[PDB]
Design a protein around this ligand. Structure first.
Ligand code: 8JR
Length: 136
């Protein structure tokens, strides 16, 4: 199989900046202690593609997580803050768009390549957080 546009996300990434993440987590409903510990973490994100399957791993002192998925196909996800959600991830004009649904709520996580960075924009209702990753 040949190259895919989504190969631009493949690699090992490290968190270098975070804005408004505590307020985003508050809007999602994350409790005090999890917010405090999760907000300290500086995760590494490892993204790989094998055929139609994309795998995103996150390693940190807070939690280690791994999801594998096919674009447009819903899957079960237990998030780092221990929500059990239904997730669907699609590609929209170069942007990975990840929607998590649970308990009648939903949040959208967008991942995009910007210069040499991977920029993650998390939205819950009117509250947005921006997390920026660089190559490890
Ligand atoms: C480090 O603590 C966390 C990690 C991951 C998630 S998440 O799995 O639900 N989605 C998500 C949200 C924000 C940033 C990223 C990112 O990529 O940096 C992300 F993937 C969390 C959700 C709530 C509270 C803490 C979370």
């Amino acid at each position: 199989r040949g190259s895919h546009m989504c190969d631009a996300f493949v690699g090992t990434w490290k968190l270098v900046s975070s804005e408004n993440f505590d307020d985003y987590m508050k809007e999602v409903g994350v409790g005090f202690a999890t917010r405090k510990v999760a907000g300290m973490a500086k995760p590494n994100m490892i993204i790989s593609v094998n055929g139609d399957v994309i795998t995103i791993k996150s390693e940190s002192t807070f939690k280690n997580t791994e999801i594998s998925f096919i674009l447009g196909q819903e899957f079960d996800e237990v998030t780092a803050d221990d929500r059990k959600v239904k997730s669907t991830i699609t590609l929209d004009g170069g942007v990975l768009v990840h929607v998590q649904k649970w308990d009648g709520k939903s949040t959208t996580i967008k991942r995009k390549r910007e210069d040499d960075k991977l920029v993650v924009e998390c939205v819950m209702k009117g509250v947005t957080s921006t997390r920026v990753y660089e190559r490890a």
